[PDB]
Enzyme design. Structure first.
Site, PDB file in Angstrom:
ATOM      1  N   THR A   1       0.854  -1.221   0.000  1.00 16.95           N
ATOM      2  CA  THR A   1       0.000   0.000   0.000  1.00 16.95           C
ATOM      3  C   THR A   1       0.875   1.251   0.000  1.00 16.95           C
ATOM      4  OG1 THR A   1      -1.736  -1.193   1.222  1.00 16.95           O
ATOM      5  CG2 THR A   1      -1.919   1.214   1.128  1.00 16.95           C
ATOM      6  N   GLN A   2       0.612   2.137  -0.957  1.00 17.12           N
ATOM      7  CA  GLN A   2       1.402   3.351  -1.144  1.00 17.12           C
ATOM      8  C   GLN A   2       0.530   4.531  -1.575  1.00 17.12           C
ATOM      9  OE1 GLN A   2       3.729   1.134  -4.589  1.00 17.12           O
ATOM     10  NE2 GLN A   2       3.628   3.315  -5.121  1.00 17.12           N
ATOM     11  N   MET A 107      -1.056  -6.468  -2.764  1.00 21.92           N
ATOM     12  CA  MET A 107      -1.414  -5.227  -2.057  1.00 21.92           C
ATOM     13  C   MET A 107      -0.351  -4.126  -2.148  1.00 21.92           C
ATOM     14  SD  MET A 107      -4.559  -5.317  -1.073  1.00 21.92           S
ATOM     15  CE  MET A 107      -4.771  -4.061   0.189  1.00 21.92           C
ATOM     16  N   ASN A 108       0.583  -4.287  -3.081  1.00 17.03           N
ATOM     17  CA  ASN A 108       1.604  -3.282  -3.360  1.00 17.03           C
ATOM     18  C   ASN A 108       1.597  -2.924  -4.850  1.00 17.03           C
ATOM     19  OD1 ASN A 108       5.209  -3.078  -3.441  1.00 17.03           O
ATOM     20  ND2 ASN A 108       3.751  -1.474  -2.854  1.00 17.03           N
TER      21      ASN A 108
END
Lengths: 233, 233
Positions: A1-2, A107-108
């Protein structure tokens, strides 16, 4: 997550009778700050494919490095790397589409919206979209971000369906793209006047145009507009 | 001399030979004969199946890898299963990730590297099977001979197994004839049936004895057995 830090706005594209046209402006926005102006957001792969990326620029540079590695990897133990076994626009897209989906599943995600434009070996036009979610779709006209809301309605007036494709020439298709870039410069607060344009044709090949500017702007009507309602002077 | 350096594959002989690799090659010569040949449009595999008893079934020799690729075995069947399964996965990887049909030349490179890793490390054994890979890709028809040593060679025609020299001498003599058999599958099969018959010594090729496979321009890799090979007897 970013979260995206340095961003690139719309990437708009359409297909004509002999190939595809893709364009993106040269801006690298840092939030509200228009920080960088010498950013090429269209990445040519070989002589038959151009990859336009919007969103996170650091992720774009990573994708740019992956595409260069793909060319190097495809040429390994391959005597037909410039002929039959050359990189097709379909191979380049599917690889990116796999990466984009795998990254969101971990999730990235790579915070981008990508349009792969090119002409296949048989002569067919290739135009497909892929984003950070891994969502893929094809359309006669494709655009990211603000281009989807503003450029698409304009480009669909030229090509509304698949039957309008062979009717549209290079001159009319490019005119619609250049006009769409002017409209995006009018209403998008994260847009640049300077832009790059790429034409991929089955006859004339790849034509990459740099340092193009938005011209013939209408601003003269502003002098007649004063106040916000009742003010006369 | 030979007894001291054949304990495991990791050991070199004073002359520079690898006896464990050489013994693995000997397993092919003990195995049943199979013939591979091609033209400009089609590629053909002809294999002689072997039975244990008259009450036993004839063990299969040809394995399908993809819709455009397949191979015939000579030697250890389980080792052929492992290598064909790997090649099935490599063809599958290219189609899913790159939307690309795997090149037959690149498929030979992948089989070369996997066989090599078994010859340089301790504890491992070389594969005890020879493979004849046929396929049709973007560069046309292909035929490749796989050896447990890792050596993979692209050929117009070849034969491996017991008494395979008779078939190999035939194909070397008929070279100019079967290469020009374009757009006619049946005549290329007959050229391979006449090739494999040159290796016969024990018996004649019968209905449930012969195994033929073909892949071409507009022909997916299909295996013919029993009643389907009766017209070539």
């Amino acid at each position: 997550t970013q979260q995206p830090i340095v961003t690139g706005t719309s990437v708009i594209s359409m297909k004509y009778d002999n190939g595809v046209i893709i364009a993106a402006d040269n801006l690298g926005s840092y939030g509200s700050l228009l920080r960088f102006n010498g950013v090429e957001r269209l990445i040519p792969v070989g002589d038959n494919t151009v990859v336009g990326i919007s969103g996170d620029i650091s992720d774009m540079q990573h994708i740019e490095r992956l595409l260069k590695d793909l060319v190097t990897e495809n040429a390994y133990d391959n005597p037909l790397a410039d002929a039959e076994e050359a990189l097709e626009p379909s191979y380049i897209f599917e690889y990116l589409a796999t990466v984009m989906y795998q990254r969101r599943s971990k999730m990235n995600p790579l915070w981008n919206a990508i349009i792969v434009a090119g002409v296949q070996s048989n002569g067919d036009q290739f135009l497909r979209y892929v984003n950070l979610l891994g969502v893929t779709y094809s359309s006669p006209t494709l655009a990211t971000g603000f281009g989807a809301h503003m450029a698409n309605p304009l480009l669909r007036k030229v090509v509304d369906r698949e039957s309008d494709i062979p009717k549209t020439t290079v001159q009319v298709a490019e005119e619609a793209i250049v006009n769409a870039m002017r409209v995006l410069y009018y209403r998008d607060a994260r847009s640049s006047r300077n832009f790059s344009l790429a034409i991929i044709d089955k006859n004339t090949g790849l034509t990459f145009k740099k340092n193009l500017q938005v011209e013939n702007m209408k601003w003269d009507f502003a002098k007649d507009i004063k106040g916000y309602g009742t003010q006369k002077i | 001399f030979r007894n001291n350096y054949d304990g495991d594959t990791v050991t070199f002989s004073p002359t520079g030979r690898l006896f464990q690799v050489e013994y693995a090659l000997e397993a092919i010569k003990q195995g049943s004969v199979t013939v591979g040949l091609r033209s400009n449009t089609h590629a053909v595999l002809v294999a002689l199946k072997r039975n244990a008893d008259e009450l036993s079934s004839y063990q299969k020799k040809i394995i399908k890898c993809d819709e455009h690729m397949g191979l015939s075995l000579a030697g250890l069947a389980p080792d052929a299963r492992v290598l064909s399964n790997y090649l099935r996965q490599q063809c599958n990887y290219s189609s899913l990730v790159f939307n690309r049909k795997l090149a037959v030349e690149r498929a030979g490179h992948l089989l070369c590297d996997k066989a090599q890793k078994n010859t340089q490390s301790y504890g491992g054994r070389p594969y005890g099977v020879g493979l004849l890979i046929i396929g049709y890709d973007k560069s046309g028809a292909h035929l490749l001979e796989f050896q447990p040593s890792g050596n993979v060679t692209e050929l117009y025609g070849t034969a491996i197994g017991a008494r395979s020299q008779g078939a190999k001498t035939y194909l070397e003599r008929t070279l100019d004839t079967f290469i020009k058999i374009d757009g006619n599958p049946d005549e290329l099969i007959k050229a391979g049936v006449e090739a494999i018959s040159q290796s016969l010594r024990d018996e004649s090729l019968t209905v449930d004895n012969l195994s033929i496979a073909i892949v071409g321009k507009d022909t997916p890799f299909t295996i013919y057995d029993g009643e389907a090979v009766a017209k070539y007897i």
